[PDB]
Write a protein that binds this DNA or RNA. Structure first.
Ligand SMILES: Nc1ccn([C@@H]2O[C@H](COP(=O)(O)OP(=O)(O)OP(=O)(O)O)C[C@H]2O)c(=O)n1
Ligand SMILES: Nc1ccn([C@@H]2O[C@H](COP(=O)(O)OP(=O)(O)OP(=O)(O)O)C[C@H]2O)c(=O)n1
Ligand SMILES: Nc1ccn([C@@H]2O[C@H](COP(=O)(O)OP(=O)(O)OP(=O)(O)O)C[C@H]2O)c(=O)n1
Ligand SMILES: [Mn+2]
Ligand SMILES: [Mn+2]
Length: 1264
RNA sequence: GGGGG
RNA sequence: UAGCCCCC
């Protein structure tokens, strides 16, 4: 460690709280990181005096592996395939030798790539050559699922840990996290690699590059080493930063060693991934003596997902695990995969926890951080053949006799059907009618928003559409000469803009291109990039599904994103007396087929939508005639609406199936079109659709089936007390059945077990295999809960991991920084040990802050000052002679955050600056007599500040665009959007109205007329950048670094005029013995103190924020937050109502709605959060898990502590100031380490009035 | 672009 | 060729 100490000495102390941070030391540390050679990191690793406890037997078979050749074969269709041995799952990358297939690299003679000879033979068509190429390309792919070379993360860890234990400012003692000599993962990493390199001078087992992966030419290297090493590094970092129990961590290493010792690392990982969760989380408290859990009340209406904390629920034996024991299956699993030693140890330790508390949840969390974090990989061919093959077993089909004769592509489900489909059909029919009945549905704007949803910069099987169209002699415009990417639905929209639906209808049946996605702890999933006409025609399906979800059930719309996964719901559901069943449906997409679901859904919508859609087109789709054969004998023609025409065309596609075009670039010669009946993922209907069926069937079970299939009084009573509107929350195929508890305790476990078994049997009737789980735990949207405590899963957030489905190279340097910041933010949300995490993050950041640049032998270097990271959100450890660790990771981002940390030490800074020569006679309002301008330019604080705000990726705008084709394109886009003259007429009105009442007040008027331009830009910025555009990006960053400044942004200079007084610590908002988030306990002072004093966010963040906008949606391309900001700004700038009415007309509203919302906005008392947007202030993401609403309202006093001040008084017409002022106070409170404190407005330099004018100038100048 | 179903 | 839905 002397190697590390010498090279990063001063920097190490700067990030350990011992010495101040300085850009000079930081940049040198950066240069040192870049000058360190890979092999040096290993040499550094050798310098570590590892303890015996950090060692464990390493399997010799991890090095000696068979040839890959017996693991593959050519199938009947000539595709290269993986040959199974351990089951139908054994389709991943096998653990084999690989050096025999490599050619030494010219220069790195010890490293090699796949023999060019072998690929050439493979390309010629040689079976053996193809097999070898496939293996080589997929093994390479497996090794690319990381963000950057492992050595960088390791070096970072060495540098960070060289600082020793950290002194907690709050607890006033050093932490007791074992040093690296006790880190088993690192030891293994060094040994495994050393053993591989053997006598070779090169210590790296492989090199992650841009030109591709290269393997160390050693007979001991295996295709399984990259994944193994990647798991070890994560575990190594986590043991030091999450303060994980070392003994547990070793268990995680053993599993990984076993995975590398097996015949397939990924496969083995997939089969054993439940070990830690099953033997801890799902086995906790078989016995229970005490502890406390939350006591929440679910407010009304439950749909708001709003809860209120009511105290603590004392625990006792009464609440011990009552759910069935998983011991047997868990042990069988361990025995089957050679891990019974691990399962047994976990089972034993889990039993020792008889109290539910911080210690016990941290144990679970720790255990669950040890699961491999690799993104499983297998060839595309394998994913497609495993996911689009299995078909649902409909044990009780809809009788053929129950369908009427056809009505085009659909058949009505006779109302005399005794089938359970009866209910599924009624729900979709009902919702279809109500949806189509809504007036908004027939508003040109609404239909523009819908037509604009799928017009995006992402793909849409562009090539297949062009050819399915060529098949009927219809050639689309090619716009020869435009600098935009052609494979975008945006390009598609422009091509189709001026063609009648009848000419593009065939495209609805065009093939579907391949799209893949790798996941952690899961298998790769195939994706279907539907084309514009396919997405268009899917509208009715999507809208009806949305209507069901918004009006008929209890569901959360989104994908996930911590807190957006409604944390509050899990706390409630998992807290005794309450209990929850974690319902999930396997093979969801493959279970939604025409045989039972789609034929019914298509029918119900087609019919229920009839009367209100009659005699009318929809979203560009015309009405038409179709053959009618409903009645027997009677055969006529039937007029249907455009909406019906859509269902008509969509039904034709759902019936036939999807032609998936598979071009497997990892498997030479594996080109085939696979037909499948599995439901599309890339469809706008997918998510909402599955959510709707989920609740609909659960409703039917609880209302009909269940009751009719049992006479058991308790079960009948239990089911009767459950409602899909009050007790069942779902999204897609995930479900959470919440059984509220009584004073008599919780509902009988045996009665619950009966209900579940019936649900299970119930789904077999229509092809659904319910994955039900009753284990005393709550699991929803990959969020884990036990006894009201959230258990972060560190396993799913691989520090070094990064999904990479395609072969394309990683984005140019700059890009990596956003990823590193994301790694930091995940740690904040996962609750790692704040100091250890912050210090490590500074090391990591520093190690990626420098890049070598080229301009033609013009070898320079791009360096980001430490200050850029602060701007991005990374808190300072110690600066300007301040105490160490005074800054919390809840410090805001950007200007708000800069304001916060600077205000907390304004005086320290001023004093430091003067005592170091930065003095002047001019007395600064913020920094007194400190020559701040000279200081900030020299320290690179201004530089870093501005560099952080520059594009971290090449720009394509400015590419020579031949004006004529450029106008044709944007015209096509315009016609697509402005199809309906009514809409256009609306915007033109807003326009001339704007010139009279709004023009001049603000300069950011959002307008539908901009969309075509924003769409063009999007298609542009989607294309591959050139090396020139790259240089241009660097030059920009480098010019900002050279330039010298005299101030911060106009908004930051304005906030700095405001001063506060931090006062009394707040009282606890929740009980301090209450486990809310594992890892967030008295051992993690700042996070814990913030959680306790500020309080947890007990409402859904989606619901909360939906109340901070006047309009929820708008045409894709415009920014809802932008529209909201313009309206409020106009109001704040004294604009007349007619001006807001004009703004609203320009974004598509009818004059009546426009005038109404405008008049409504004028007289409204706007909330803190919504109002703060007038100046671009947003609630920080890191704050989302806390009760920031309460902080703004009751703990940021705008009235000075000692009464009113002339400067602090808020002018009559400037009440909007209070919202901005609330954010600034909150900033300082949240940025200060420790307990949330009450803060009092102390001063505003030039007074409130002048502050307001200052903000009003910023407002009216945006976009000039 | 980032983090997540 | 590389989809859809969400927090900044
Ligand atoms: N990028 C993504 C990720 C997920 N999904 C959707 O999420 C839904 C279900 O999620 P999973 O549980 O992850 O998919 P399953 O096929 O059901 O996996 P298996 O039963 O193992 O869980 C269906 C799928 O289309 C999606 O459209 N796009
Ligand atoms: N002032 C410097 C010089 C080099 N590098 C880093 O070095 C790496 C590759 O170049 P080297 O071959 O390692 O640089 P050398 O200067 O030739 O090595 P040193 O003096 O020991 O010889 C990439 C580049 O960013 C750097 O960050 N800053
Ligand atoms: N913004 C960037 C990114 C990369 N390059 C050029 O790309 C070439 C090699 O790519 P890298 O592998 O990304 O650069 P290295 O210095 O070899 O190391 P890495 O980015 O970790 O620093 C050399 C470098 O000048 C550049 O000029 N400007
Ligand atoms: Mn599922
Ligand atoms: Mn699921």
């Amino acid at each position: 460690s002397s190697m590390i100490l010498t090279q990063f000495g001063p920097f190490i102390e700067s990030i350990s709280g011992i010495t101040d941070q300085s850009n000079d030391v930081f940049e040198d540390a950066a240069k040192a990181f870049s000058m360190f050679t890979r092999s040096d990191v290993y040499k550094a690793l050798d310098e570590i005096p590892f303890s015996d406890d950090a060692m464990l037997p390493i399997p010799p078979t991890i090095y000696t592996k068979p040839s890959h050749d017996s693991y593959y074969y050519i199938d009947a269709l000539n595709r290269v395939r993986r040959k199974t041995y351990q089951g139908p799952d054994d389709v991943y990358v096998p653990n084999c030798s690989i050096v025999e297939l490599l050619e030494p690299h010219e220069t790195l003679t010890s490293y090699g790539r796949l023999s060019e000879a072998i690929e050439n033979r493979a390309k010629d068509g040689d079976s053996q050559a193809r097999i070898a190429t496939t293996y080589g390309r997929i093994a390479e792919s497996q090794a690319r699922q990381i963000k950057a070379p492992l050595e960088k993360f390791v070096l970072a860890l060495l540098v960070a840990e060289a600082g020793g234990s950290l002194y907690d400012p709050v607890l006033q003692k050093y932490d007791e996290i074992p040093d690296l000599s006790h880190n088993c993962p690192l030891w293994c990493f060094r040994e495994i690699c050393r053993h591989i390199s053997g006598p070779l001078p090169d210590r790296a087992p492989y090199l992650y590059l841009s030109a591709g992966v290269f393997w160390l030419m050693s007979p001991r290297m295996t295709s399984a080493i990259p994944p193994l090493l990647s798991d070890l590094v994560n575990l190594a970092i986590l043991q030091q930063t999450a303060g994980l129990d070392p003994s547990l961590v070793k268990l995680g290493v053993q599993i990984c060693l076993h995975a590398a010792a097996s015949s397939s690392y990924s496969w083995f990982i997939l089969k054993t991934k439940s070990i830690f969760p099953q033997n801890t989380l799902h086995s906790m408290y078989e016995s229970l003596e005490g502890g406390y859990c939350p006591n929440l009340e679910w407010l009304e209406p439950r749909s708001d997902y709003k809860f209120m904390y009511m105290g603590v629920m004392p625990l006792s034996a009464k609440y011990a695990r009552s759910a069935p024991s998983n011991d047997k299956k868990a042990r069988e699993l361990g025995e089957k995969y050679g891990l019974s030693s691990v399962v047994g140890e976990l089972r034993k330790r889990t039993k020792t926890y008889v109290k539910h508390d911080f210690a016990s949840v941290r144990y679970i969390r720790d255990a669950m951080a040890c699961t491999s974090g690799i993104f499983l990989v297998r060839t595309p061919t394998e994913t497609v053949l495993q996911e689009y093959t299995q078909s649902p077993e409909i044990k009780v089909p809809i009788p053929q006799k129950d369908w009427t004769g056809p009505i085009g592509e659909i058949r009505i489900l006779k109302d005399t059907t005794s089938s359970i489909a009866r209910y599924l059909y009624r729900t979709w029919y009902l919702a279809a009618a109500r949806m189509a009945a809504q007036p908004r549905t027939w508003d040109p704007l609404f239909q523009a928003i819908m037509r604009s949803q799928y017009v995006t910069a992402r793909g849409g099987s562009g090539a297949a559409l062009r050819e399915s169209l060529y098949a009927i002699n219809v050639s689309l415009p090619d716009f020869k000469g435009l600098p935009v990417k052609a494979a975008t639905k945006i390009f598609q929209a422009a091509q189709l803009a001026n063609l009648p639906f009848s000419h593009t209808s065939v495209a609805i049946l065009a093939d579907t291109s391949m799209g893949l996605r790798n996941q952690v702890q899961r298998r790769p999933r195939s994706i279907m990039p539907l084309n514009v006409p396919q997405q268009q025609v899917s509208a009715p399906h999507t809208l009806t599904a949305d209507y069901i979800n918004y009006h008929m059930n209890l569901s959360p719309t989104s994908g996930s994103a911590v807190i957006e996964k409604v944390i509050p719901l899990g706390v409630y559901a998992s807290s005794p007396p309450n209990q929850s069943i974690n319902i999930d449906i396997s093979a969801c997409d493959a279970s939604i087929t025409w045989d039972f679901f789609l034929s019914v859904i298509m029918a119900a919508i087609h019919e229920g939508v009839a009367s209100s859609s009659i005699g009318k087109p929809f979203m560009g789709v015309p009405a038409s005639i179709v053959n009618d054969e409903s009645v027997v004998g009677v055969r006529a023609a039937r007029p249907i609406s455009g909406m019906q025409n859509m269902i008509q065309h969509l039904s034709k596609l759902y019936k036939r199936g999807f032609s998936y075009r598979v071009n497997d670039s990892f498997s030479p010669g594996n080109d085939f079109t696979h037909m499948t009946t599995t439901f599309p993922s890339g469809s706008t209907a997918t998510s909402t659709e599955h959510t709707a069926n989920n609740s609909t069937m659960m409703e039917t079970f609880l209302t009909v089936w269940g009751p009719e299939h049992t006479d058991d009084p308790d079960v009948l009573r239990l089911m009767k007390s459950l409602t899909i509107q009050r007790n069942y929350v779902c999204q897609g195929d995930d479900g959470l059945m919440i059984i509220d508890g009584t004073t008599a305790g919780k509902v009988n476990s045996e009665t619950i077990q009966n209900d579940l078994e019936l649900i299970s049997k119930y789904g077999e009737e229509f092809g659904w295999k319910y994955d039900i789980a009753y284990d005393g735990t709550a699991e929803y949207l990959k969020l884990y809960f036990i006894f009201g405590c959230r258990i972060p899963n560190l396993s799913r957030h691989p520090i070094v991991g990064k999904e990479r489905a395609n072969s394309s190279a990683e984005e140019p340097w700059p890009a990596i920084l956003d990823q590193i910041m994301g790694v930091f933010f995940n740690g904040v949300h996962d609750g790692l040990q704040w100091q250890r995490w912050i210090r490590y993050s500074w090391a990591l950041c520093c190690a990626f802050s420098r890049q070598r640049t080229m301009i033609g032998e013009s070898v320079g270097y791009l360096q980001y000052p430490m200050w850029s990271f602060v701007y991005w959100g990374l808190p300072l450890v110690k600066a300007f002679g301040s105490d160490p660790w005074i800054f919390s990771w809840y410090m805001p981002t950007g200007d708000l955050g800069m304001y916060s940390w600077i205000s907390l030490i304004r005086p320290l800074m001023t004093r430091w600056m003067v005592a170091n020569g930065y003095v002047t006679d001019r007395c600064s309002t913020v920094f007194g007599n400190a020559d701040y301008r000279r200081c900030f330019n020299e320290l690179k604080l201004y530089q870093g500040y501005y560099m952080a705000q520059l594009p971290r990726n090449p720009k394509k705008s400015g590419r020579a665009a031949s004006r004529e084709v450029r106008e044709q394109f944007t015209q096509a886009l315009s016609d697509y959007l402005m199809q309906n003259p009514e809409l256009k007429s609306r915007v033109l009105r807003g326009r001339s109205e704007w010139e009279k009442y709004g023009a001049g007040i603000i300069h950011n008027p959002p307008s539908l007329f901009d969309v075509p331009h924003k769409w063009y830009q999007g298609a542009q910025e989607a294309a591959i950048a050139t090396r020139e555009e790259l240089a241009e990006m660097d030059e920009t960053l480098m010019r900002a670094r050279r330039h010298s400044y005299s101030s911060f942004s106009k908004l930051l200079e304005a906030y700095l005029l405001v001063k506060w007084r931090m006062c009394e610590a707040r009282e606890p908002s929740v009980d301090l013995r209450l486990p809310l988030c594992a890892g967030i306990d008295p051992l993690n002072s700042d996070p814990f103190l913030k959680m306790v004093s500020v309080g947890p966010m007990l409402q859904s963040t989606r619901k909360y924020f939906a109340q901070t906008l006047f309009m929820a949606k708008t045409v894709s391309g415009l920014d809802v937050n932008a529209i909201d900001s313009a309206l409020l700004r106009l109001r704040t700038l004294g604009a007349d109502k007619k001006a807001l009415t004009a703004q609203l007309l320009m974004v598509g509203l009818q004059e009546s709605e426009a005038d109404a919302l405008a008049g409504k906005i004028m007289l409204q008392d706007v909330n803190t959060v919504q109002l703060a947007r007038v100046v671009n202030l947003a609630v920080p993401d890191t704050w989302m898990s806390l009760d920031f609403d309460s902080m703004f309202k009751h703990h940021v006093k705008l009235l000075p502590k000692d009464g009113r001040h002339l400067n602090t008084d808020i002018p009559p017409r400037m009440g909007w100031l209070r919202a901005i002022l609330r954010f600034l106070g909150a900033g300082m409170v949240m940025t200060a380490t420790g307990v949330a404190v009450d803060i009092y407005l102390e001063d505003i330099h030039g007074g409130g009035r002048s502050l307001g004018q200052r903000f009003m100038t910023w407002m009216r100048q945006e976009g000039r």
